[PDB]
Amino acid sequence: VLKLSEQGVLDKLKSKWWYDKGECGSKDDKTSALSLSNVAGVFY
């Protein structure tokens, strides 16, 4: 187990079976400036 841990095998297995087989495939700032979407109606 220690040898596997140090060779990265456990990390890779976790990555594979949590993320690489992940339905979502999401792995992840707010400026707070108003965006065009906040005033689009007034342009329309």
């Binding site: 965006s35 065009l36 979407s37 689009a40 342009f43 329309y44």
Partner: protein
């Protein structure tokens, strides 16, 4: 300066139409980090997205424009690129009127209608840009296709103004 005015009008009409058609065709509207099918640097347009680096580089995939009435309508309108296309159509008709003016100097309203087409093209262009940007919101940069659309708007409005000046001066001169 009627000769020069007509020159500006014709050159400008062609320039606006060319820029807008290229923009609607080409695929450098947006630089983002999506996927052509890990996420890498891409370059999307109105219809296709493409990879800018790595193994699948040069590979492009049709944009899944689709995955709340307002969200539905925005997604619909952005999917079909109604407004960029309508602006291309109107620029085409404006160009037709500008060309037709010389071959039929009898009727005045031809160049007036050219001007109005150009103005309307600019308005459709604006709506397009807003819809595009708004639909994207639902890091990144804008490419040269986007700016082609923008410059098309500016030139279209200039040509519209010049056309209406031509019509005004014709009616002013002939009437008095």
């Amino acid at each position: 300066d009627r000769g020069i005015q007509m020159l500006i009008t014709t050159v400008g009409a062609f320039a606006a139409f060319s820029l807008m058609t290229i923009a609607v065709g080409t695929d450098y509207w947006l630089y983002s980090r999506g996927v052509c099918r890990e996420e890498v640097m891409t370059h999307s347009g109105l219809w296709r997205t493409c990879c800018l680096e790595g193994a699948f580089r040069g590979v492009c995939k049709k944009i899944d424009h689709f995955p709340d009435t307002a969200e539905y309508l925005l997604r619909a309108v952005r999917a079909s690129s109604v407004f960029p296309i309508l602006s291309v159509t109107l620029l085409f008709f404006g160009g037709l009127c500008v060309a037709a003016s010389e071959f039929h100097r009898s009727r005045h309203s031809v160049i007036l209608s050219a001007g109005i087409f150009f103005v309307s093209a600019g308005l459709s262009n604006i709506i397009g840009i807003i819809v595009y940007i708004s639909a994207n919101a639902g890091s990144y940069s804008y490419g040269w296709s986007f700016y082609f659309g923008a410059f098309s708007f500016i030139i279209a409005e200039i040509v519209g103004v010049v056309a209406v000046h031509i019509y005004i001066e014709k009616h002013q001169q002939l009437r008095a």
